[PDB]
Design an enzyme around this catalytic site. Structure first.
Site, PDB file in Angstrom:
ATOM      1  CG  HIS A   9       8.632  -2.410   1.963  1.00 52.57           C
ATOM      2  ND1 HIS A   9       9.684  -1.971   2.737  1.00 52.57           N
ATOM      3  CD2 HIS A   9       7.596  -1.581   2.225  1.00 52.57           C
ATOM      4  CE1 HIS A   9       9.298  -0.923   3.441  1.00 52.57           C
ATOM      5  NE2 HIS A   9       8.035  -0.666   3.148  1.00 52.57           N
ATOM      6  CB  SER A  61       7.389   1.339   5.592  1.00 46.31           C
ATOM      7  OG  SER A  61       7.687   1.865   4.315  1.00 46.31           O
ATOM      8  CE1 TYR A  62       8.128   9.555   7.904  1.00 49.77           C
ATOM      9  CE2 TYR A  62       8.573   9.562   5.552  1.00 49.77           C
ATOM     10  CZ  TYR A  62       8.531  10.222   6.762  1.00 49.77           C
ATOM     11  OH  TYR A  62       8.888  11.545   6.834  1.00 49.77           O
ATOM     12  CG  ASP A 115      12.402  -3.891   1.164  1.00 47.57           C
ATOM     13  OD1 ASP A 115      11.995  -3.114   0.276  1.00 47.57           O
ATOM     14  OD2 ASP A 115      11.968  -3.890   2.336  1.00 47.57           O
ATOM     15  CE1 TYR A 174       3.949   3.484   6.563  1.00 46.07           C
ATOM     16  CE2 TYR A 174       3.102   5.650   5.932  1.00 46.07           C
ATOM     17  CZ  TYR A 174       3.717   4.452   5.594  1.00 46.07           C
ATOM     18  OH  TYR A 174       4.096   4.220   4.288  1.00 46.07           O
TER      19      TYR A 174
HETATM   20  C1  LIG Z   1      -2.764   8.167  -2.928  1.00 47.97           C
HETATM   21  O1  LIG Z   1      -1.738   7.417  -3.584  1.00 47.97           O
HETATM   22  C2  LIG Z   1      -0.580   6.985  -2.970  1.00 47.97           C
HETATM   23  C3  LIG Z   1      -0.452   6.858  -1.580  1.00 47.97           C
HETATM   24  C4  LIG Z   1       0.743   6.413  -1.023  1.00 47.97           C
HETATM   25  C5  LIG Z   1       0.873   6.289   0.366  1.00 47.97           C
HETATM   26  C6  LIG Z   1       2.056   5.844   0.970  1.00 47.97           C
HETATM   27  C7  LIG Z   1       3.174   5.501   0.210  1.00 47.97           C
HETATM   28  C8  LIG Z   1       3.141   5.598  -1.268  1.00 47.97           C
HETATM   29  C9  LIG Z   1       1.889   6.066  -1.911  1.00 47.97           C
HETATM   30  C10 LIG Z   1       1.769   6.184  -3.290  1.00 47.97           C
HETATM   31  C11 LIG Z   1       0.567   6.632  -3.850  1.00 47.97           C
HETATM   32  O2  LIG Z   1       0.396   6.772  -5.203  1.00 47.97           O
HETATM   33  C12 LIG Z   1       1.389   6.363  -6.134  1.00 47.97           C
HETATM   34  C13 LIG Z   1       4.356   5.218  -2.083  1.00 47.97           C
HETATM   35  C14 LIG Z   1       5.580   4.991  -1.202  1.00 47.97           C
HETATM   36  N1  LIG Z   1       6.609   4.240  -1.963  1.00 47.97           N
HETATM   37  C15 LIG Z   1       5.229   4.253   0.078  1.00 47.97           C
HETATM   38  C16 LIG Z   1       6.464   4.056   0.863  1.00 47.97           C
HETATM   39  C17 LIG Z   1       6.974   5.130   1.589  1.00 47.97           C
HETATM   40  C18 LIG Z   1       8.134   4.988   2.331  1.00 47.97           C
HETATM   41  F1  LIG Z   1       8.615   6.024   3.028  1.00 47.97           F
HETATM   42  C19 LIG Z   1       8.802   3.782   2.348  1.00 47.97           C
HETATM   43  F2  LIG Z   1       9.925   3.660   3.085  1.00 47.97           F
HETATM   44  C20 LIG Z   1       8.297   2.705   1.617  1.00 47.97           C
HETATM   45  C21 LIG Z   1       7.129   2.836   0.874  1.00 47.97           C
HETATM   46  F3  LIG Z   1       6.668   1.781   0.173  1.00 47.97           F
HETATM   47  O3  LIG Z   1       4.317   5.062   0.812  1.00 47.97           O
END
Ligand SMILES: COc1cc2ccc3c(c2cc1OC)C[C@H](N)[C@@H](c1cc(F)c(F)cc1F)O3
Ligand SMILES: *[C@@H]1O[C@H](CO)[C@@H](O[C@H]2O[C@H](CO)[C@@H](O)[C@H](O[C@H]3O[C@H](CO)[C@@H](O)[C@H](O[C@H]4O[C@H](CO)[C@@H](O)[C@H](O)[C@@H]4O)[C@@H]3O)[C@@H]2O)[C@H](O)[C@H]1NC(C)=O
Ligand SMILES: COc1cc2ccc3c(c2cc1OC)C[C@H](N)[C@@H](c1cc(F)c(F)cc1F)O3
Ligand SMILES: *[C@@H]1O[C@H](CO)[C@@H](O)[C@H](O)[C@H]1NC(C)=O
Ligand SMILES: *[C@@H]1O[C@H](CO)[C@@H](O)[C@H](O)[C@H]1NC(C)=O
Lengths: 727, 727
Positions: A701, A591-592, A669, A508
Site C-alpha cells: 500500500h 487509498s481512501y 497490497d 483524501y
Molecule cells: C489516530 O489513529 C489512527 C489514525 C488513522 C488514520 C487513517 C487511517 C487509519 C488510522 C488508524 C489509527 O489508529 C489505529 C487506519 C486505516 N487502515 C487507514 C486506511 C484507510 C483506508 F480507507 C484505506 F483504504 C487504507 C488505509 F490504510 O487510514
C-alpha cells in the site's frame, strides 16, 4: 529560473532537518550526531559522548536501531530487521553491558524475535517469539516462558494480528508493563475462524513458482478475531513451575456479542484501566480494575465502570480516547465529544460518572500531551479559529479560566502548527513547529515556560530555498449551508490571478481527515506548482476532522456520499474564483483518496478531465471490519447492506466514458487488496471504457521502495502533463 | 468509399462463410443449415432433413454442441459448457433416441463429465467423471466403472493433465477406441510430485475473498508427471467383478529416465502403435503391439520397434509425427526429416527398421491426409517454391515418380492454400481454399478427381467489400547469408511507393512458426492498413517452419537469439525500401511473439520506436517443461542453464530507455503466468524506465472474452496511433 524539479523531490535535493530526541530522564535526552549517540542536559547544555559509532565495528551485523534501559545500565541492539506490515516486523537482538563495555552472550534473545521491550524502570525484558511471551529479569539470566498457546496465524500472545495492529493499537505489541515494572499485562488474540486473504508474491526473478501469502484478515461482516486480557506478576516467577496469568474478562456489556479491547492504561501499580468496544462501535465501556494482595486476582468494581456512547455515530475519532490518571489514580482526564459535538477534555472522578468539561468552545482538543499536579498540557486548534492550526496550551487544574497558550505567539508568522515532546516527569518540553514556515525546534522549561535554546532552525535549507522559485500557499475557507469549509492551495511562483492555471485536486477526504492545514511540506505538489505551474488544491468537506461532530459524523453509515459531493462542489467553487482554466481540472488520491477520486469520476459531473487513483478502495465489503464497520455498520439486510452495495466504484463505470483515468496498484497490497482494483478494471472493460493502468510487482500500500516510489511519481507526472498539454 | 474500421473487426461486420460438414459414410455428409441438420448425397446434392431445427424446443436448456453416433440411432446433447483450459472443459449430457424420438432419462451420464465419446462404430459410450473412466454399452443401461484410482489434480484416468493437454495431444481426452469398438485404450497420468502454480481469481464482484487457483504445472526443470498406458476389452465387461486393464509398459530405453507418451494410433482390430519420447526430446521410440487371444495380453515385438532420433535438434515439428497404417496393418507411412533436412513421407514395413522416402526435394510435406490401395494423399508446399502455400497431392503407391497435384491449378490466382476432408473410404473429398482470395469450398470425386459443385464461394461478402477501401497482401522474400527468408505486408489502399509509410511488425517467430503465408484474413491488421495507413508486416526468419531443419533447428538450445536477431535485420531491410518511414517502425506480438518483441525492444538496436508485448514469456524457467525443454534442454549446470539465464527480458531492462513500451497480460493466464510480466515491470522499475501497462482481470492467455477482446485491441490502437502521430 531554477524551480523545484521532480528530481529534487525524488532525490532529496533539499533535505528537511528534524530534531528527534529520546527523553531518558526528567533532566536529559539522547541525540544522533556523526552516528554517535549524545546525551544532553536540559537546563545547562552539559553535553557528553554517551556512545560512539566506533564501538560497534567488528559486530558483523548492521545495526538498525537501539534502546537504552531506563536505569541506564544496558542498551538493546536491533539487527536483521525484516519488515512485515505497517508497524510489525522481526529482528535479531543483542545486549551490551555499557558499564562493563561488554557484549552479552548468555542466554541470548532468539533470532526472528517479533517484539521486545524493557520495563519502565530497572532492566527487566519482555519479548515475543513464535507468538509466545518470554520474560528476562536479568539480561544474562535464562528467560521465563509465560505463554504456551502461541501458534502462527491463529493464536497471538503479547502481539497483535493484522486488524488490531492496523486499526486499533497502531502497534505490533500487545504488552503493558506497570509503572514500577512488577506486573506485565497482555492481550491474547485468536484468529482461528477468521478467513484468510490470499495473494501472490513473486520475489527475485530466481524464484520459479510464486509464493502464495496467506494472512488472517476479516473483511466487512466476516468472522472477527476474539480477544482475551491477562495479567502476570513478574516478581513472583518460578523457575520450577509454570507462570500463572490471571485473566481479566470483558464486562457483560461486551460478552453478549462481538467486541474489541481498544485501550489499556495503568493508573497506579495496583490499578489498570481497560476500554472495550462493541463491534457496532457506538457503545464503549471502561473498567477500572484493582489488584488485591489477598486473593492474588484482579477486581473490576462495577461502581468504577464508565460507559461512553454516541447517538450520532462512532465513539472517539478512530477509537475511544485515552485516560490520563491523577497521582492517586482516583480521577482521570479524557477527551470526550461534548453536548455541542465538539471534542474537549472531561475531568472524571472514578466513582462519579458524569464528568466536568474543563474546556469548551467551537474548537477541539487534539490530545492531552502531559498531566501534572497543577497543570494539564494539551494541543488544540483554538488559535484564530483555525481548524488546521496546532498549538500547545496549559490549563491550571485549580481554576479552568487560567488557560495559557505556550506556543501561539513565539513566531506567529512562521509557526501555526506545533507538536510537543515532554521530559519524563514533565519538567521540560521540546516544541516542534512543522509550519507554515521552515520547521523550527526549540527546548523549553515547564516551570516558568522560558525559551531555553533553539535546537534546530533549518537555516541551511533556508539558504538553499532563497534561490528557488518556490510556490506560495493559501489557506482559507468557503461557506456552504452557513458552514465554513476550509481549503488550501499550493499556488505557483509569481501567481497572477488574471491568468488561468490548470488545477489538481489532492484528495483524501476520509473520516476525520484534514488536508487543509498550515504544515510546511516538500512533496509532489511542490514540484507541480513550482515547475509546471499547477495549482494543487485540497479541500476538507463533510466527514473531515477536528471541527466537531456536526461535520465529522455527517457521513455516518454513508461513505461515498457527502464527502464525494463536497470534493466536486469544491472544484466548482475553485472555477468561480476566476484563476482556473476549467478545461484543465484534474483529481487524484491514494487509498481512501483513490476511492473518493474514483467515485468522483464515476459521479459524471464532467468537472474533471482526468483523474488518478492509487491503491483505491472499490467496494467496502473488500476492506477490513474494524475500519469499514466503524462508519458503515454491518453489511446485512438488517443493518446497512444496501448502502454497502450502492457505494461501489464498479456501479458507476459507465460514467468514466467522459474522463481519462489512471488506475495504479501494488500487487502485494495486504491492506487495500489488489482485488479492489481488479474489480474496477473488470467493470470498466465490461462497459467498454478505455483507461490507463499500472501494477507494481510486490509493492504494498505504501509503494515506498526507492525505485517504485520514483517510478510511480514519474508515471503520474507524465499522465498529468499530457492531460494538461504541457511540454 | 469507406474504410475497414476497428469497429468492423471488433463487431464482426464482414463475416466469412464456412462449410463445416461431417462425413457419416463413404457417400453422405451432414450439414447444419440454419439449425436444420441435413444429410447430403455427395454424388448429387440430394439432401433430406436428418433432424429438425425444432425437435428440442421444449428441452429448456441451451444445447452447446451435439454428437450423433455412427449407427445413427442416438444423438448426444452437450449443455452446461464450462471452459477450463485450451481444450478441456466439463458439461452436462443428455442422450436422445432418434428412432423413437424420445429422451433417455435412466442411468444418465452424470453432470460435470470431463469427456465423453462414442465408439467409432455402433453406439457405445466411454466417458470420464472425477478422473475415472466409465463405459456404457447401451445408452439406457447402467455404466461400468473401469478405473478407481482417479483423484482431482493427482491422478487422471482417460484425460490429460495440464501439460499433456497443452503440449502433447492438443486435447483433453486420453481415450482411444479400437476401430470396431472392441478395445478401449487409455492413458493414466500421476501428477502427485508435480508442483502447483497458484494465482488469484477474483470472480464476480459479489465474491468477498478471491479464490487461489491451484494447477499442477511443471515449469522447466521441475518434476514432470508420469504416464501409464492400458487397454481393456469392452465386449467382456462384467457387472459383478471390477474390470481388467492390461498395461502396456513403455520400452526399456524410455524407463531409464523421464519420458512422455506422445502418440497412440490403432492400426487394426488387434494392433495398436505407441510412440514414446525421452524428456530430452531428441529420441523417440515406437512400439507396435498385437493382441494375444490365448492369454488375453498385449505384446509388442522388438522386431516391430522403431527408433527415431536427431542430431540437429528435436524429433518432429512439435512431437513425433503420426503413422498412417495400411489396411492389413503390415506397413505405414509417416512424415520424417530426411538426409537433406526436409520433412517427407517415409514408407515403413512394421518388422523392418529402415524405410524408403516416397517424396523428396527442397520443400516439405505438411501432412498425410488419406490412404487407399494405390494412392496416398498429402498436403505440401511444393507448388511454386512457396513455403507459405498449401496444395493437395496424390502419389501412386506402385510408382513414386508419378505425382499428381489435385488443387494446384483449380484457380491459381485465387487459391494457394488448401486443406481437405475425405469420405469414409476416400471416395469423395471437400477441398477448402483459405486464400489469398476469398475462401472457396468445393466437393470432389476421388475416382477421377472431377469437380462436382461449388459448396460456398463467399459471394455475399465479395459484394460487401466493393464499397470498402481494402488493403493488399504482398508475399515475398529477402536474402540473408544467401538464403531466402519469406515475409508478407498488409499494404494500405492506394499504395503510393513514392510516399513513406509507418511500419508495424506483427511478430510470433516461435519454433516452427509461419506468419508469412497465402491465407485471407480479416483481422486487426486489416484495420491498421485500411484506416490508419499502416503497413503491417510479418517475417519468418531462422527458427521458422516448413523450410527444412537448416532453418528450423538454427535456434536449438538457443532461444531468444537468431529468431530475435532476424526480426531486427528484417526491420532494417524494410527501412531500406524507400516507402518505409524509418522514424516510425513499431513491433508487436502475443505470446512467444511477446517474448520476441520484448527481447527486440531491449536489444538496443535503435530500429524500433515503440512496441507492444502481450502475455509475453520473460524467462524460460517460468514456462512449462514439455515445450521449453524441447528447444532448450534442462536448466542445469550440466546442460544449458547458462543460456536459460542469458536469455531473459529482464537482463535487457536498461535498454528500454530508448523505446515506448506497452506490456499487457491477463491475471488468470494459466499458461504464461502473470508472473512472467510481473518480473518484467519490476526490472523496468528497478532500473528506472517508463513504460505503459495493462492487466486484464480474470482473463487467460487468449484474452478472448467479448469485452476483453474489444478493450485490448481498442487500447493497442490508441497506443500505435499516438506513437505514429496519427489522428
Ligand atoms: C489516530 O489513529 C489512527 C489514525 C488513522 C488514520 C487513517 C487511517 C487509519 C488510522 C488508524 C489509527 O489508529 C489505529 C487506519 C486505516 N487502515 C487507514 C486506511 C484507510 C483506508 F480507507 C484505506 F483504504 C487504507 C488505509 F490504510 O487510514
Ligand atoms: C481459539 O478459538 C477456538 C475457537 O474459535 C478454540 O477452539 C475451540 O473451539 C473449537 C472450534 O474451532 C472446538 O472444536 C473446540 O471445542 C470443542 O471441541 C469439540 C468439537 O470438535 C467438542 O466435542 C468439545 O466438546 C466436548 O468437550 C467439552 C469439554 O472439553 C464439553 O464441554 C462438551 O460437552 C464435549 O464433551 C469442545 O466443545 C476448541 O476447544 C481455541 O481453543 C481458542 N484458543 C485459545 C483461546 O487459546
Ligand atoms: C502442431 O501442433 C502444435 C502447434 C503449436 C503451436 C504453438 C504453440 C503450441 C503448439 C502445440 C501443438 O501441439 C501440441 C503449444 C504452446 N504451449 C504454445 C505457446 C508457446 C509459447 F511460447 C507461449 F508463450 C505460449 C503458448 F501457449 O504455442
Ligand atoms: C507447563 O505447561 C506446558 C503445557 O504446554 C507443559 O508442556 C510444560 O511441560 C509445563 N512446564 C512445567 C514446568 O510445568
Ligand atoms: C502416484 O505416484 C506416487 C509416488 O509419487 C505413488 O505413491 C502413488 O501410489 C502413485 N499412484 C498411482 C495410481 O500410480
Amino acid at each position: 529560473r531554477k524551480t523545484y524539479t521532480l528530481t529534487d523531490y525524488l532525490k532529496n535535493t533539499y533535505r528537511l532537518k528534524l530534531y528527534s530526541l529520546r527523553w531518558i530522564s526528567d533532566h536529559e535526552y539522547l541525540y544522533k550526531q556523526e552516528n554517535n549517540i549524545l546525551v544532553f542536559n536540559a537546563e545547562y547544555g552539559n553535553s557528553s559522548v554517551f556512545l560512539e559509532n566506533s564501538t560497534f565495528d567488528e559486530f558483523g551485523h548492521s545495526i538498525n536501531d537501539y534502546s537504552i534501559s531506563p536505569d541506564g545500565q544496558f542498551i538493546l541492539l536491533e539487527y536483521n530487521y525484516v519488515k512485515q506490515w505497517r508497524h510489525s516486523y522481526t529482528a535479531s537482538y543483542d545486549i551490551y553491558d555499557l558499564n562493563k563495555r561488554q557484549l552479552i552472550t548468555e542466554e541470548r534473545i532468539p533470532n526472528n524475535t517479533q517484539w521486545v521491550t524493557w520495563s519502565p524502570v530497572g532492566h527487566k525484558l519482555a519479548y515475543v517469539w513464535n507468538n509466545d511471551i518470554y520474560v528476562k529479569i536479568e539480561p544474562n539470566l535464562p528467560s521465563y516462558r509465560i505463554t504456551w498457546t502461541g501458534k502462527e496465524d491463529i493464536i497471538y500472545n503479547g502481539i497483535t494480528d493484522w486488524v488490531y495492529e492496523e486499526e486499533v493499537f497502531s502497534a505490533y505489541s500487545a504488552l503493558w508493563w506497570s509503572p514500577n515494572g512488577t506486573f506485565l499485562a497482555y492481550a491474547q488474540f485468536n484468529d482461528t475462524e477468521v478467513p484468510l486473504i490470499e495473494y501472490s508474491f513473486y520475489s527475485d526473478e530466481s524464484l520459479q513458482y510464486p509464493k502464495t501469502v496467506r494472512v488472517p484478515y476479516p473483511k466487512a461482516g466476516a468472522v472477527n478475531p476474539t480477544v482475551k486480557f491477562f495479567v502476570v506478576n513478574t516478581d513472583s516467577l518460578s523457575s520450577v513451575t509454570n507462570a500463572t496469568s490471571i485473566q481479566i474478562t470483558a464486562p457483560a456489556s461486551m460478552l453478549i456479542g462481538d467486541h474489541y479491547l481498544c485501550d489499556v492504561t495503568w493508573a497506579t501499580q495496583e490499578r489498570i484501566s481497560l476500554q472495550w468496544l462493541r463491534r457496532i462501535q457506538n457503545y464503549s465501556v471502561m473498567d477500572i480494575c484493582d489488584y488485591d494482595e489477598s486473593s492474588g486476582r484482579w477486581n473490576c468494581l462495577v461502581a468504577r465502570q464508565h460507559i461512553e456512547m454516541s447517538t450520532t455515530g462512532w465513539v472517539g475519532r478512530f477509537r475511544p480516547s485515552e485516560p490520563h490518571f491523577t497521582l492517586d489514580g482516583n480521577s482521570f482526564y479524557k477527551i470526550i465529544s461534548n453536548e455541542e459535538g465538539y471534542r474537549h477534555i472531561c475531568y472524571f472522578q472514578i466513582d462519579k460518572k458524569d464528568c466536568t468539561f474543563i474546556t469548551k468552545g467551537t474548537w477541539e482538543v487534539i490530545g492531552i500531551e502531559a498531566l501534572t499536579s497543577d497543570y494539564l498540557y494539551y494541543i488544540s486548534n483554538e488559535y484564530k479559529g483555525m481548524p488546521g492550526g496546532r498549538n500547545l496550551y496549559k490549563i491550571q487544574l485549580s481554576d479552568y479560566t487560567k488557560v495559557t497558550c505556550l506556543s501561539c505567539e513565539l513566531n506567529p508568522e512562521r509557526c501555526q502548527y506545533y507538536s510537543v515532546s515532554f521530559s519524563k516527569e514533565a519538567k521540560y518540553y521540546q516544541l516542534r513547529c512543522s509550519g507554515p514556515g521552515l520547521p523550527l525546534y526549540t527546548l523549553h522549561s515547564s516551570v516558568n515556560d522560558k525559551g531555553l535554546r533553539v535546537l534546530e532552525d533549518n537555516s541551511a535549507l533556508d539558504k538553499m530555498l532563497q534561490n528557488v522559485q518556490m510556490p506560495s500557499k493559501k489557506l482559507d475557507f468557503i461557506i456552504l449551508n452557513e458552514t465554513k469549509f476550509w481549503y488550501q492551495m499550493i499556488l505557483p511562483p509569481h501567481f497572477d490571478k488574471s491568468k488561468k492555471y490548470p488545477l489538481l485536486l489532492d484528495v483524501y477526504a476520509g473520516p476525520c481527515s484534514q488536508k487543509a492545514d498550515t504544515v510546511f511540506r516538500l512533496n509532489w505538489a511542490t514540484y507541480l506548482a513550482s515547475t509546471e505551474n499547477i495549482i494543487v488544491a485540497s479541500f476538507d468537506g463533510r466527514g473531515s476532522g477536528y471541527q466537531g461532530d456536526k461535520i465529522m459524523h455527517a457521513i455516518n453509515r454513508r461513505l461515498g456520499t457527502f464527502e464525494v459531493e463536497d470534493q466536486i462542489e469544491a472544484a466548482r467553487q475553485f472555477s468561480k474564483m476566476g484563476f482556473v482554466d476549467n478545461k484543465r481540472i484534474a483529481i487524484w488520491g491514494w487509498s481512501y483518496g483513490g476511492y473518493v477520486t474514483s467515485m468522483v469520476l464515476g459521479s459524471g459531473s464532467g468537472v474533471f478531465k482526468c483523474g488518478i487513483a492509487v491503491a483505491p478502495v472499490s467496494r467496502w465489503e473488500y476492506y477490513d471490519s474494524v475500519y469499514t464497520e466503524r462508519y458503515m455498520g454491518l453489511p446485512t439486510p438488517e443493518d446497512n447492506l444496501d448502502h454497502y452495495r450502492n457505494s461501489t466504484v464498479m456501479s458507476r463505470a459507465e460514467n468514466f466514458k467522459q474522463v481519462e483515468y489512471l488506475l495504479i496498484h501494488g500487487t502485494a497490497d495486504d491492506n487495500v487488496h489488489f482485488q479492489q482494483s481488479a474489480q474496477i478494471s473488470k467493470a470498466l472493460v465490461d462497459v467498454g471504457v478505455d483507461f490507463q493502468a499500472m501494477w507494481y510487482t510486490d509493492e504494498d500500500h505504501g509503494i515506498a521502495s526507492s525505485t517504485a516510489h520514483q517510478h510511480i511519481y514519474t508515471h503520474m507526472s507524465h499522465f498529468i502533463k499530457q492531460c494538461f498539454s504541457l511540454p
